[PDB]
PDB file of all heavy atoms in Angstrom:
ATOM      1  N   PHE A 152     152.927 -78.139 125.114  1.00  0.00           N
ATOM      2  CA  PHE A 152     153.913 -78.923 124.369  1.00  0.00           C
ATOM      3  C   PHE A 152     155.341 -78.452 124.544  1.00  0.00           C
ATOM      4  O   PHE A 152     155.649 -77.259 124.410  1.00  0.00           O
ATOM      5  CB  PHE A 152     153.596 -78.927 122.872  1.00  0.00           C
ATOM      6  CG  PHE A 152     152.365 -79.703 122.513  1.00  0.00           C
ATOM      7  CD1 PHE A 152     151.116 -79.092 122.544  1.00  0.00           C
ATOM      8  CD2 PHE A 152     152.453 -81.036 122.136  1.00  0.00           C
ATOM      9  CE1 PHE A 152     149.975 -79.793 122.209  1.00  0.00           C
ATOM     10  CE2 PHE A 152     151.315 -81.755 121.810  1.00  0.00           C
ATOM     11  CZ  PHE A 152     150.077 -81.133 121.837  1.00  0.00           C
ATOM     12  N   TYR A 153     156.211 -79.415 124.816  1.00  0.00           N
ATOM     13  CA  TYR A 153     157.645 -79.190 124.792  1.00  0.00           C
ATOM     14  C   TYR A 153     158.274 -80.088 123.732  1.00  0.00           C
ATOM     15  O   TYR A 153     158.923 -81.082 124.060  1.00  0.00           O
ATOM     16  CB  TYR A 153     158.247 -79.464 126.171  1.00  0.00           C
ATOM     17  CG  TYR A 153     157.912 -78.384 127.175  1.00  0.00           C
ATOM     18  CD1 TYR A 153     156.701 -78.391 127.850  1.00  0.00           C
ATOM     19  CD2 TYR A 153     158.802 -77.349 127.433  1.00  0.00           C
ATOM     20  CE1 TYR A 153     156.384 -77.396 128.762  1.00  0.00           C
ATOM     21  CE2 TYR A 153     158.495 -76.351 128.341  1.00  0.00           C
ATOM     22  CZ  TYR A 153     157.286 -76.381 129.002  1.00  0.00           C
ATOM     23  OH  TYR A 153     156.979 -75.396 129.905  1.00  0.00           O
ATOM     24  N   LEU A 154     158.062 -79.735 122.464  1.00  0.00           N
ATOM     25  CA  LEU A 154     158.616 -80.495 121.342  1.00  0.00           C
ATOM     26  C   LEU A 154     160.110 -80.248 121.173  1.00  0.00           C
ATOM     27  O   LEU A 154     160.664 -79.298 121.739  1.00  0.00           O
ATOM     28  CB  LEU A 154     157.870 -80.188 120.033  1.00  0.00           C
ATOM     29  CG  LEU A 154     156.676 -81.126 119.797  1.00  0.00           C
ATOM     30  CD1 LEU A 154     155.570 -80.758 120.744  1.00  0.00           C
ATOM     31  CD2 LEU A 154     156.183 -81.127 118.356  1.00  0.00           C
ATOM     32  N   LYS A 155     160.761 -81.117 120.401  1.00  0.00           N
ATOM     33  CA  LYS A 155     162.203 -81.038 120.229  1.00  0.00           C
ATOM     34  C   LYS A 155     162.613 -79.796 119.461  1.00  0.00           C
ATOM     35  O   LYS A 155     162.070 -79.498 118.399  1.00  0.00           O
ATOM     36  CB  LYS A 155     162.761 -82.270 119.517  1.00  0.00           C
ATOM     37  CG  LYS A 155     164.253 -82.129 119.185  1.00  0.00           C
ATOM     38  CD  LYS A 155     164.891 -83.447 118.751  1.00  0.00           C
ATOM     39  CE  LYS A 155     164.257 -83.989 117.478  1.00  0.00           C
ATOM     40  NZ  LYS A 155     164.988 -85.173 116.917  1.00  0.00           N
ATOM     41  N   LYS A 156     163.582 -79.076 120.012  1.00  0.00           N
ATOM     42  CA  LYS A 156     164.187 -77.962 119.308  1.00  0.00           C
ATOM     43  C   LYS A 156     165.624 -78.322 118.951  1.00  0.00           C
ATOM     44  O   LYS A 156     165.899 -78.709 117.814  1.00  0.00           O
ATOM     45  CB  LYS A 156     164.074 -76.682 120.139  1.00  0.00           C
ATOM     46  CG  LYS A 156     162.611 -76.285 120.319  1.00  0.00           C
ATOM     47  CD  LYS A 156     162.400 -75.057 121.183  1.00  0.00           C
ATOM     48  CE  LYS A 156     160.917 -74.706 121.220  1.00  0.00           C
ATOM     49  NZ  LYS A 156     160.632 -73.441 121.964  1.00  0.00           N
ATOM     50  N   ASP A 157     166.523 -78.245 119.927  1.00  0.00           N
ATOM     51  CA  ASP A 157     167.937 -78.530 119.692  1.00  0.00           C
ATOM     52  C   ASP A 157     168.380 -79.894 120.245  1.00  0.00           C
ATOM     53  O   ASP A 157     169.126 -80.620 119.590  1.00  0.00           O
ATOM     54  CB  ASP A 157     168.807 -77.415 120.289  1.00  0.00           C
ATOM     55  N   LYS A 158     167.910 -80.234 121.442  1.00  0.00           N
ATOM     56  CA  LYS A 158     168.401 -81.408 122.173  1.00  0.00           C
ATOM     57  C   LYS A 158     167.350 -82.517 122.257  1.00  0.00           C
ATOM     58  O   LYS A 158     166.179 -82.247 122.529  1.00  0.00           O
ATOM     59  CB  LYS A 158     168.806 -81.005 123.592  1.00  0.00           C
ATOM     60  CG  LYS A 158     169.970 -80.031 123.676  1.00  0.00           C
ATOM     61  N   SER A 159     167.775 -83.759 122.040  1.00  0.00           N
ATOM     62  CA  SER A 159     166.885 -84.915 122.167  1.00  0.00           C
ATOM     63  C   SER A 159     166.729 -85.348 123.625  1.00  0.00           C
ATOM     64  O   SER A 159     165.693 -85.899 124.002  1.00  0.00           O
ATOM     65  CB  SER A 159     167.400 -86.099 121.344  1.00  0.00           C
ATOM     66  OG  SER A 159     167.206 -85.895 119.953  1.00  0.00           O
ATOM     67  N   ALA A 160     167.757 -85.122 124.440  1.00  0.00           N
ATOM     68  CA  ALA A 160     167.659 -85.461 125.861  1.00  0.00           C
ATOM     69  C   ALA A 160     166.590 -84.579 126.499  1.00  0.00           C
ATOM     70  O   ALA A 160     166.485 -83.386 126.186  1.00  0.00           O
ATOM     71  CB  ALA A 160     168.997 -85.285 126.557  1.00  0.00           C
ATOM     72  N   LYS A 161     165.802 -85.153 127.402  1.00  0.00           N
ATOM     73  CA  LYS A 161     164.566 -84.497 127.841  1.00  0.00           C
ATOM     74  C   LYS A 161     164.634 -83.763 129.173  1.00  0.00           C
ATOM     75  O   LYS A 161     163.741 -82.976 129.493  1.00  0.00           O
ATOM     76  CB  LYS A 161     163.419 -85.519 127.864  1.00  0.00           C
ATOM     77  CG  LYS A 161     162.956 -85.908 126.466  1.00  0.00           C
ATOM     78  CD  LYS A 161     161.878 -86.987 126.504  1.00  0.00           C
ATOM     79  CE  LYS A 161     161.226 -87.116 125.141  1.00  0.00           C
ATOM     80  NZ  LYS A 161     160.114 -88.110 125.185  1.00  0.00           N
ATOM     81  N   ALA A 162     165.682 -84.008 129.955  1.00  0.00           N
ATOM     82  CA  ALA A 162     165.736 -83.473 131.317  1.00  0.00           C
ATOM     83  C   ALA A 162     165.618 -81.945 131.391  1.00  0.00           C
ATOM     84  O   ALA A 162     165.007 -81.409 132.316  1.00  0.00           O
ATOM     85  CB  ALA A 162     166.997 -83.954 132.043  1.00  0.00           C
ATOM     86  N   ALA A 163     166.197 -81.247 130.419  1.00  0.00           N
ATOM     87  CA  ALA A 163     166.171 -79.785 130.432  1.00  0.00           C
ATOM     88  C   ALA A 163     164.739 -79.283 130.310  1.00  0.00           C
ATOM     89  O   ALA A 163     164.360 -78.306 130.952  1.00  0.00           O
ATOM     90  CB  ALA A 163     167.036 -79.217 129.310  1.00  0.00           C
ATOM     91  N   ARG A 164     163.944 -79.958 129.486  1.00  0.00           N
ATOM     92  CA  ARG A 164     162.532 -79.608 129.352  1.00  0.00           C
ATOM     93  C   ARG A 164     161.746 -79.911 130.625  1.00  0.00           C
ATOM     94  O   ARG A 164     160.853 -79.144 131.001  1.00  0.00           O
ATOM     95  CB  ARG A 164     161.918 -80.307 128.140  1.00  0.00           C
ATOM     96  CG  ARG A 164     162.249 -79.598 126.827  1.00  0.00           C
ATOM     97  CD  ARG A 164     161.885 -80.440 125.616  1.00  0.00           C
ATOM     98  NE  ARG A 164     162.905 -81.444 125.314  1.00  0.00           N
ATOM     99  CZ  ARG A 164     162.777 -82.373 124.373  1.00  0.00           C
ATOM    100  NH1 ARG A 164     161.659 -82.453 123.663  1.00  0.00           N
ATOM    101  NH2 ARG A 164     163.759 -83.243 124.160  1.00  0.00           N
ATOM    102  N   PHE A 165     162.068 -81.017 131.299  1.00  0.00           N
ATOM    103  CA  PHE A 165     161.429 -81.294 132.595  1.00  0.00           C
ATOM    104  C   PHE A 165     161.706 -80.138 133.556  1.00  0.00           C
ATOM    105  O   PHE A 165     160.831 -79.723 134.328  1.00  0.00           O
ATOM    106  CB  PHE A 165     161.968 -82.568 133.252  1.00  0.00           C
ATOM    107  CG  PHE A 165     161.797 -83.823 132.438  1.00  0.00           C
ATOM    108  CD1 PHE A 165     162.538 -84.953 132.758  1.00  0.00           C
ATOM    109  CD2 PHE A 165     160.898 -83.891 131.388  1.00  0.00           C
ATOM    110  CE1 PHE A 165     162.396 -86.123 132.033  1.00  0.00           C
ATOM    111  CE2 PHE A 165     160.752 -85.071 130.657  1.00  0.00           C
ATOM    112  CZ  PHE A 165     161.501 -86.180 130.984  1.00  0.00           C
ATOM    113  N   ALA A 166     162.940 -79.643 133.538  1.00  0.00           N
ATOM    114  CA  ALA A 166     163.314 -78.517 134.397  1.00  0.00           C
ATOM    115  C   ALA A 166     162.546 -77.243 134.035  1.00  0.00           C
ATOM    116  O   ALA A 166     162.160 -76.470 134.920  1.00  0.00           O
ATOM    117  CB  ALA A 166     164.824 -78.273 134.342  1.00  0.00           C
ATOM    118  N   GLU A 167     162.334 -77.015 132.739  1.00  0.00           N
ATOM    119  CA  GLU A 167     161.570 -75.852 132.285  1.00  0.00           C
ATOM    120  C   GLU A 167     160.186 -75.874 132.898  1.00  0.00           C
ATOM    121  O   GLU A 167     159.656 -74.845 133.331  1.00  0.00           O
ATOM    122  CB  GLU A 167     161.400 -75.854 130.765  1.00  0.00           C
ATOM    123  CG  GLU A 167     162.591 -75.395 129.958  1.00  0.00           C
ATOM    124  CD  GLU A 167     162.234 -75.232 128.482  1.00  0.00           C
ATOM    125  OE1 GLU A 167     161.593 -74.216 128.134  1.00  0.00           O
ATOM    126  OE2 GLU A 167     162.581 -76.122 127.675  1.00  0.00           O
ATOM    127  N   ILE A 168     159.590 -77.062 132.902  1.00  0.00           N
ATOM    128  CA  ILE A 168     158.270 -77.258 133.493  1.00  0.00           C
ATOM    129  C   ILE A 168     158.273 -76.958 134.995  1.00  0.00           C
ATOM    130  O   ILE A 168     157.390 -76.268 135.502  1.00  0.00           O
ATOM    131  CB  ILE A 168     157.770 -78.693 133.236  1.00  0.00           C
ATOM    132  CG1 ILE A 168     157.430 -78.859 131.747  1.00  0.00           C
ATOM    133  CG2 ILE A 168     156.564 -78.986 134.103  1.00  0.00           C
ATOM    134  CD1 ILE A 168     157.347 -80.327 131.294  1.00  0.00           C
ATOM    135  N   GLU A 169     159.269 -77.465 135.708  1.00  0.00           N
ATOM    136  CA  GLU A 169     159.375 -77.177 137.139  1.00  0.00           C
ATOM    137  C   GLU A 169     159.558 -75.678 137.435  1.00  0.00           C
ATOM    138  O   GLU A 169     159.062 -75.173 138.447  1.00  0.00           O
ATOM    139  CB  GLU A 169     160.503 -77.992 137.761  1.00  0.00           C
ATOM    140  CG  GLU A 169     160.200 -79.492 137.845  1.00  0.00           C
ATOM    141  CD  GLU A 169     161.447 -80.316 138.137  1.00  0.00           C
ATOM    142  OE1 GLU A 169     162.568 -79.781 137.977  1.00  0.00           O
ATOM    143  OE2 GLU A 169     161.309 -81.497 138.522  1.00  0.00           O
ATOM    144  N   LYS A 170     160.256 -74.971 136.551  1.00  0.00           N
ATOM    145  CA  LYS A 170     160.469 -73.535 136.732  1.00  0.00           C
ATOM    146  C   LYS A 170     159.171 -72.756 136.568  1.00  0.00           C
ATOM    147  O   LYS A 170     159.063 -71.618 137.035  1.00  0.00           O
ATOM    148  CB  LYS A 170     161.524 -73.000 135.761  1.00  0.00           C
ATOM    149  N   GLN A 171     158.188 -73.362 135.904  1.00  0.00           N
ATOM    150  CA  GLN A 171     156.888 -72.722 135.731  1.00  0.00           C
ATOM    151  C   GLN A 171     155.973 -72.900 136.951  1.00  0.00           C
ATOM    152  O   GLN A 171     154.809 -72.503 136.921  1.00  0.00           O
ATOM    153  CB  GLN A 171     156.188 -73.203 134.456  1.00  0.00           C
ATOM    154  CG  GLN A 171     156.908 -72.805 133.170  1.00  0.00           C
ATOM    155  CD  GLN A 171     157.227 -71.321 133.134  1.00  0.00           C
ATOM    156  OE1 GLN A 171     156.348 -70.485 133.321  1.00  0.00           O
ATOM    157  NE2 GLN A 171     158.495 -70.988 132.918  1.00  0.00           N
ATOM    158  N   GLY A 172     156.502 -73.484 138.023  1.00  0.00           N
ATOM    159  CA  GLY A 172     155.740 -73.614 139.258  1.00  0.00           C
ATOM    160  C   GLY A 172     155.040 -74.949 139.443  1.00  0.00           C
ATOM    161  O   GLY A 172     154.164 -75.094 140.301  1.00  0.00           O
ATOM    162  N   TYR A 173     155.426 -75.925 138.630  1.00  0.00           N
ATOM    163  CA  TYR A 173     154.855 -77.266 138.712  1.00  0.00           C
ATOM    164  C   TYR A 173     155.779 -78.215 139.439  1.00  0.00           C
ATOM    165  O   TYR A 173     157.005 -78.102 139.346  1.00  0.00           O
ATOM    166  CB  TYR A 173     154.603 -77.816 137.304  1.00  0.00           C
ATOM    167  CG  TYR A 173     153.459 -77.142 136.607  1.00  0.00           C
ATOM    168  CD1 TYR A 173     153.666 -76.011 135.820  1.00  0.00           C
ATOM    169  CD2 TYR A 173     152.160 -77.614 136.751  1.00  0.00           C
ATOM    170  CE1 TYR A 173     152.617 -75.385 135.187  1.00  0.00           C
ATOM    171  CE2 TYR A 173     151.102 -76.991 136.113  1.00  0.00           C
ATOM    172  CZ  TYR A 173     151.337 -75.876 135.339  1.00  0.00           C
ATOM    173  OH  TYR A 173     150.281 -75.259 134.700  1.00  0.00           O
ATOM    174  N   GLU A 174     155.188 -79.170 140.151  1.00  0.00           N
ATOM    175  CA  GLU A 174     155.934 -80.313 140.639  1.00  0.00           C
ATOM    176  C   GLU A 174     155.465 -81.526 139.842  1.00  0.00           C
ATOM    177  O   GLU A 174     154.269 -81.813 139.802  1.00  0.00           O
ATOM    178  CB  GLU A 174     155.688 -80.533 142.135  1.00  0.00           C
ATOM    179  CG  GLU A 174     156.306 -81.824 142.651  1.00  0.00           C
ATOM    180  CD  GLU A 174     156.289 -81.933 144.169  1.00  0.00           C
ATOM    181  OE1 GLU A 174     156.218 -80.887 144.847  1.00  0.00           O
ATOM    182  OE2 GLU A 174     156.347 -83.073 144.677  1.00  0.00           O
ATOM    183  N   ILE A 175     156.392 -82.219 139.190  1.00  0.00           N
ATOM    184  CA  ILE A 175     156.027 -83.356 138.349  1.00  0.00           C
ATOM    185  C   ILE A 175     155.774 -84.582 139.220  1.00  0.00           C
ATOM    186  O   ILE A 175     156.674 -85.046 139.920  1.00  0.00           O
ATOM    187  CB  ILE A 175     157.120 -83.674 137.313  1.00  0.00           C
ATOM    188  CG1 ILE A 175     157.365 -82.449 136.415  1.00  0.00           C
ATOM    189  CG2 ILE A 175     156.717 -84.891 136.481  1.00  0.00           C
ATOM    190  CD1 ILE A 175     158.737 -82.451 135.706  1.00  0.00           C
ATOM    191  N   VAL A 176     154.549 -85.101 139.187  1.00  0.00           N
ATOM    192  CA  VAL A 176     154.174 -86.175 140.103  1.00  0.00           C
ATOM    193  C   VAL A 176     154.412 -87.557 139.511  1.00  0.00           C
ATOM    194  O   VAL A 176     154.568 -88.534 140.247  1.00  0.00           O
ATOM    195  CB  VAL A 176     152.714 -86.034 140.620  1.00  0.00           C
ATOM    196  CG1 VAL A 176     152.542 -84.708 141.368  1.00  0.00           C
ATOM    197  CG2 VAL A 176     151.705 -86.155 139.471  1.00  0.00           C
ATOM    198  N   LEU A 177     154.453 -87.638 138.183  1.00  0.00           N
ATOM    199  CA  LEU A 177     154.802 -88.882 137.508  1.00  0.00           C
ATOM    200  C   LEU A 177     155.159 -88.617 136.049  1.00  0.00           C
ATOM    201  O   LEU A 177     154.812 -87.568 135.490  1.00  0.00           O
ATOM    202  CB  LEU A 177     153.664 -89.906 137.608  1.00  0.00           C
ATOM    203  CG  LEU A 177     152.352 -89.628 136.879  1.00  0.00           C
ATOM    204  CD1 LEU A 177     152.385 -90.263 135.504  1.00  0.00           C
ATOM    205  CD2 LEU A 177     151.165 -90.173 137.677  1.00  0.00           C
ATOM    206  N   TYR A 178     155.858 -89.586 135.460  1.00  0.00           N
ATOM    207  CA  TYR A 178     156.310 -89.542 134.078  1.00  0.00           C
ATOM    208  C   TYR A 178     155.744 -90.761 133.393  1.00  0.00           C
ATOM    209  O   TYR A 178     155.723 -91.850 133.974  1.00  0.00           O
ATOM    210  CB  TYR A 178     157.835 -89.654 133.998  1.00  0.00           C
ATOM    211  CG  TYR A 178     158.588 -88.551 134.702  1.00  0.00           C
ATOM    212  CD1 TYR A 178     158.717 -88.550 136.081  1.00  0.00           C
ATOM    213  CD2 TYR A 178     159.191 -87.524 133.980  1.00  0.00           C
ATOM    214  CE1 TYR A 178     159.412 -87.546 136.732  1.00  0.00           C
ATOM    215  CE2 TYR A 178     159.891 -86.512 134.623  1.00  0.00           C
ATOM    216  CZ  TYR A 178     159.995 -86.531 135.996  1.00  0.00           C
ATOM    217  OH  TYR A 178     160.689 -85.534 136.644  1.00  0.00           O
ATOM    218  N   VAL A 179     155.315 -90.585 132.152  1.00  0.00           N
ATOM    219  CA  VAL A 179     154.826 -91.693 131.344  1.00  0.00           C
ATOM    220  C   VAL A 179     155.672 -91.791 130.078  1.00  0.00           C
ATOM    221  O   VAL A 179     155.957 -90.777 129.444  1.00  0.00           O
ATOM    222  CB  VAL A 179     153.361 -91.451 130.938  1.00  0.00           C
ATOM    223  CG1 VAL A 179     152.750 -92.718 130.360  1.00  0.00           C
ATOM    224  CG2 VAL A 179     152.558 -90.975 132.142  1.00  0.00           C
TER     225      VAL A 179
END
Side-chain angles (χ1 to χ4, degrees), chain A residues 152-156 159-169 171-179:
Chain A
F152 291 87
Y153 287 83
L154 270 73
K155 173 168 62 172
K156 296 177 176 185
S159 287
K161 287 176 167 183
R164 280 168 279 174
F165 301 163
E167 281 189 77
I168 290 162
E169 290 166 344
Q171 295 309 307
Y173 289 90
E174 173 170 337
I175 301 159
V176 300
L177 67 93
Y178 299 77
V179 192

